[PDB]
Amino acid sequence: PLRADAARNRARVLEVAYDTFAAEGLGVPMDEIARRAGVGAGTVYRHFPTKQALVVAVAEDRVRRIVDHARTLLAAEGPGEALFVFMRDMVRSAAADYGLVDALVGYGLDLEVAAPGAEAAFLATLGELLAAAQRAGTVRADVDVAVIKALLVSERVVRVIEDGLRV
């Protein structure tokens, strides 16, 4: 119950910090991060004793969120279409995840150092969506996840890719 308050509180903070990292960066004080999350500063600090620790906790969370998104998509859209939705969603979310990398950069940190397993998780994720879609017969059999990985006016460029990906 107080467990669940904490769980709500830190998820609130992470999502606000994600948005703050995306748009403004590391210039925004923890206090204002605290304020936008509807929570006090010492609480942020109790989970996140420093700013880089917030940055790394946002990085892990976002990686986990991308992995959960893919599975929700497989459920919601089906094996046939989930890869296409996922790739479009990664595209849409590029500006945000830009601001997160930059933040991870300001601290001399990488994704695979802050969120260990990240590389592998993303790969295995793309891997399952591609296998599912090849199985469903919507995507060409002669493509591997390394090619999907590489593929990841803009909307026109994305449609050629999708159309060249279909069977």
UniProtKB/TrEMBL annotation:
Keyword Signal in annotation: no
Pfam family, one: TetR_N
Domain of life: Bacteria
The keyword DNA repair is assigned to this record: no
Limits of the HTH tetR-type domain: 7-66
Keywords from the UniProt entry: DNA-binding, Transcription, Transcription regulation
Any one GO molecular function term: DNA-binding transcription factor activity
Coiled coil: none
InterPro entries, sorted: Homeodomain-like_sf (IPR009057), HTH-type_TetR-like_transc_reg (IPR050109), HTH_TetR (IPR001647), Tet_transcr_reg_TetR-rel_C_sf (IPR036271), TetR_SbtR-like_C (IPR049445)
DNA-binding region: 29-48
Name of the protein described by the UniProt record: Transcriptional regulator, TetR family
